[PDB]
Design a protein around this ligand. Sequence first.
Ligand code: FES
Ligand SMILES: [K+]
Ligand SMILES: [K+]
Ligand SMILES: [K+]
Ligand SMILES: [K+]
Ligand SMILES: [K+]
Ligand SMILES: [K+]
Ligand SMILES: [Mg+2]
Ligand SMILES: [Mg+2]
Ligand SMILES: [Mg+2]
Ligand SMILES: [Mg+2]
Ligand SMILES: [Mg+2]
Ligand SMILES: [Mg+2]
Ligand SMILES: [Mg+2]
Ligand SMILES: [Mg+2]
Ligand SMILES: [Mg+2]
Ligand SMILES: [Mg+2]
Ligand SMILES: [Mg+2]
Ligand SMILES: [Mg+2]
Ligand SMILES: [Mg+2]
Ligand SMILES: [Mg+2]
Ligand SMILES: [Mg+2]
Ligand SMILES: [Mg+2]
Ligand SMILES: [Mg+2]
Ligand SMILES: [Mg+2]
Ligand SMILES: [Mg+2]
Ligand SMILES: [Mg+2]
Ligand SMILES: [Mg+2]
Ligand SMILES: [Mg+2]
Ligand SMILES: [Mg+2]
Lengths: 215, 108, 71, 168, 184, 135
Amino acid sequence: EDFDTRILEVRNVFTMTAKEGRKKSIRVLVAVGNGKGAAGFSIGKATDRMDAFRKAKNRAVHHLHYIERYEDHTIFHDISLRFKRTHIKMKKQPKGYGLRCHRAIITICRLIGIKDMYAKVSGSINMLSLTQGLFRGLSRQETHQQLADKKGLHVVEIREECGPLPIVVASPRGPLRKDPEPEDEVPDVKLDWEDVKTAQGMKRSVWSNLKRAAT
Amino acid sequence: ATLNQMHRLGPPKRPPRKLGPTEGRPQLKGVVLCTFTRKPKKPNSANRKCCRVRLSTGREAVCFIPGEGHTLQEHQIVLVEGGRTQDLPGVKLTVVRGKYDCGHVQKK
Amino acid sequence: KNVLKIRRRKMNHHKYRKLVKKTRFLRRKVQEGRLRRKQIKFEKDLRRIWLKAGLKEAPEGWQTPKIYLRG
Amino acid sequence: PMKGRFPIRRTLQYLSQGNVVFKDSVKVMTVNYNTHGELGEGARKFVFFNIPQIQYKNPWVQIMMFKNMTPSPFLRFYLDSGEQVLVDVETKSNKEIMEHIRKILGKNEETLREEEEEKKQLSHPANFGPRKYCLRECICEVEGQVPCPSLVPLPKEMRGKYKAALKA
Amino acid sequence: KVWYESPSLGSHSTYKPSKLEFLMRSTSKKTRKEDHARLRALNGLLYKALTDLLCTPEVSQELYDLNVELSKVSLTPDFSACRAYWKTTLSAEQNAHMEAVLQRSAAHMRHLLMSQQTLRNVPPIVFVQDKGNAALAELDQLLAVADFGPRDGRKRAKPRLEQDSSLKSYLSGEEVEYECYAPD
Amino acid sequence: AGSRLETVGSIFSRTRDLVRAGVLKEKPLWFDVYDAFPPLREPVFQRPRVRYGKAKAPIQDIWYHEDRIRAKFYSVYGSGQRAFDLFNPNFKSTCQRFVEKYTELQKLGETDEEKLFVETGKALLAEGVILRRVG
RNA sequence: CCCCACUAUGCUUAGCCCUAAACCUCAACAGUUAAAUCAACAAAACUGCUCGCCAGAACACUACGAGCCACAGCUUAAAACUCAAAGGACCUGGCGGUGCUUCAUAUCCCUCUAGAGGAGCCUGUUCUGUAAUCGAUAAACCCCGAUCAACCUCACCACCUCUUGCUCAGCCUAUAUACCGCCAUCUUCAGCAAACCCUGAUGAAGGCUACAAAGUAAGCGCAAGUACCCACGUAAAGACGUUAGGUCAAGGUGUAGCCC
Ligand code: FES
Ligand SMILES: [K+]
Ligand SMILES: [K+]
Ligand SMILES: [K+]
Ligand SMILES: [K+]
Ligand SMILES: [K+]
Ligand SMILES: [K+]
Ligand SMILES: [Mg+2]
Ligand SMILES: [Mg+2]
Ligand SMILES: [Mg+2]
Ligand SMILES: [Mg+2]
Ligand SMILES: [Mg+2]
Ligand SMILES: [Mg+2]
Ligand SMILES: [Mg+2]
Ligand SMILES: [Mg+2]
Ligand SMILES: [Mg+2]
Ligand SMILES: [Mg+2]
Ligand SMILES: [Mg+2]
Ligand SMILES: [Mg+2]
Ligand SMILES: [Mg+2]
Ligand SMILES: [Mg+2]
Ligand SMILES: [Mg+2]
Ligand SMILES: [Mg+2]
Ligand SMILES: [Mg+2]
Ligand SMILES: [Mg+2]
Ligand SMILES: [Mg+2]
Ligand SMILES: [Mg+2]
Ligand SMILES: [Mg+2]
Ligand SMILES: [Mg+2]
Ligand SMILES: [Mg+2]
């Protein structure tokens, strides 16, 4: 009862058969989630659309992922991944930002319990690749405690609304290193031209930052 | 491409946009030369009422007359707009019903 | 892969070679006329040079050669 | 993703992080560095990381690079007076090279603060004009003043349509 | 591997061609494309093994002198017998002598195949004369004996574009104890 | 309600997370034992990858100094007609007896190789060992 | 296309011409095998760096210009009109003047026996004819609906007559491509299949090995059982699906049409 089910795709698949010619079947993709981090998806196939609905939703609850959420409202860090030809770039966002994402990602995020996130889907917009690509990326996000344990350092959050106050979000459970993390004068991290073009204001699009209903 | 190649070639140049049959204008005035019907390309079947007009630019063109029933005749004045008739190959102009000598379609 | 794109190119080249074959005598008369105009256009470009420089005739001993003839 | 290694270098944020603003005397800066050798590593990183920042802050200073012309790397500055400043950079890190030339030929933080203040005098708050040059376009935007007729109509007595009608 | 596929998942499985396996094999099982290749290769080995035994003088001096040549060798997939076609000579009487020597030798040949233990589990070897010259041998034998007597445009919609109202019916409308004796 | 995503984490991580989310009402019987006495490596699915280029397995061949003596003894004298008894954990072959004498004489200060090998054969013959040279 | 003869040509020398599916269909150099192995197939997946090149299809290995020992040539290479696709890989089906293998038991060929095909007659159909039904109509129609037409049957034609009409009317009027009902057909088959489970990255798809390697399967059919003289044989039975197969004229009936 704690889980809600959402449909992501309903397709009519047509199979050519040796004796009966073209037959019509239904392939359905549905996602399930309880709104508290536990969510999954499953494909359903049947001749009837309502039998497919039963199969997918019942199967989905046996293949649940657990998704880590920062402060139970957003992701822990920016996630950029490709699944086959579908690229998904997700950005950690503060409270009140809402879900400004592909409509399917919005639906999936409500099942997981993510309230604030930006996502951009490029390349092939294949619902299945998008769904399993999204769950693969959300299931491999490192939390702040995992980062602290891995590096044996404090994770300190600086918020502009709180000024210079250092907020320790995670501390290592084991011993605490004494040697500061090396300060590379210039990081060799790969950047997204879309993010840089935006930060500089060179990104002008009539479709970006449009007024939309609360999501 | 490499950064050196992107620098050497410069920013992309858009193809100059192609003016349509109205020559980048919302409407054109025309003089009716002849009226006739055209057969739509398959699978469509109809006798679509069209006309040949001399546009104010001087070029002659075939224009579709929308609506059920028209009274256009040679030497009459019509206003033509853009928009292709999807099933009539080559017909890219449409007569404006209710302007100059082309009146509104008579009800039922 | 299929050869359907090659087949389109194949027919285009066959019909072109056949078209050139049928009209090779007209095309030869047209080509001759173009080379004459090309030579005249070349002679004018050289005449423009000495005339715009203040000379009234071609430099002493200068004869414009025929640079487009088969010879 | 952005092409090349260290794509951060090709961002306006990175290029504006240079702290070396040369004095007006500096006209030309030549960089002689070596492609190989452990002792010229700072000079290679200086050319790789900092020459773009120096040029961004000093667009009118000519910067010319020379590879493997001499056994050791060095910087040479040409001043408008005709003086030349040779800076040996062999064995120095790129951060020390930037700190060195800032000390000997860079404007101090005080000299730069003053210039920023003189620029603020150019945009006077009391001036009215286009939003490009002025905070406000018209006095009607000031609360308490007679608002714009486009937003609030004026009394018939303050309108010329009716002043002449009564007078005429 | 080659254009000929050799990625078999059960590649390491021990090939066991024995008469007993066929009786415990599932006839429901459908032979793989490469299952024939294992049989075809074994048949090639049986050809090489018999062909080599034939040309060595020591195994049987009678066999070597005959200079027998094998046309083909196809083991039965049943595994009951190893068919061993032997080319038939034109000489009519020589086809009987060769055949007789082969039948006697065949019994000893099977034991000699156990010497090459890899081919140890060989079924009874059977020799077949090539009928190309042998069938004619039977006829000509009868032919001489025989007595010849005293000589002297409706539009077809796309199936994928076919419209359905299943959702419109779904979205339009949510579809729509005590027992006692002598009750009054 | 559970998870059959065997390639997503481990049975422990999947179970621990679903217990926190309230999806699993009770912990499985094994969960507390795993927590107290966990394996050395958390059992996470991995796809074995093939090595390419200059990547090589770290496994090293196991060799001993006496292996040089064993190689020469087998070359010179062959394998002993005496049969190895690999069931007896204290079995000593003729080669091992040769190696032990060879090691004893080396510790007495002799350092030459060709000389240290000939004296060893004589010692064993004196002790009654049969050493038939292969060639 | 097959056969024969013979030339340019294939060879040499000296000049040209400068093209190829000139293709490992993999640009040069350097580096990596850890990450996610990875749309697919090809050829395991990538990083650095540089040059070249590409930006829907077709027009187009074309037009024009220019260059060239090229003159029916090569190189470079557009536009107008037109379209909503073009295209790549893969799967399924259909098909192949498609391969191999083993088969059909009154069975595809030969073999066995009696026939049909020729004659007369009987009967059905076609065609023609007639003012004068309909349906079936390749296998799977053609002594078929009919275990049956001189009247009747009868639904057809001509003429005459009746109008709330044997009926709380009637219609053998249209539609078997709206159907129930009852059937043909492969079937002289053995398969269909709900509900689950697993593989392919959770792609369209796929799921068997008995010394077994991912399938378990209710139900239906076959089978069993029963009928006839046995347990044999013959009947009966024979699923799902195939042919929008047959039948609105058995009867019933949806829709449309007729009601002096
Ligand atoms: S803008 Fe100030 S009065 Fe209108
Ligand atoms: K090739
Ligand atoms: K096929
Ligand atoms: K007959
Ligand atoms: K029926
Ligand atoms: K009926
Ligand atoms: K009816
Ligand atoms: Mg329109
Ligand atoms: Mg063409
Ligand atoms: Mg010749
Ligand atoms: Mg020669
Ligand atoms: Mg070649
Ligand atoms: Mg190159
Ligand atoms: Mg194009
Ligand atoms: Mg060409
Ligand atoms: Mg050309
Ligand atoms: Mg030309
Ligand atoms: Mg007859
Ligand atoms: Mg009839
Ligand atoms: Mg009929
Ligand atoms: Mg019919
Ligand atoms: Mg039929
Ligand atoms: Mg009658
Ligand atoms: Mg009658
Ligand atoms: Mg009637
Ligand atoms: Mg039917
Ligand atoms: Mg029976
Ligand atoms: Mg029967
Ligand atoms: Mg039965
Ligand atoms: Mg029909």
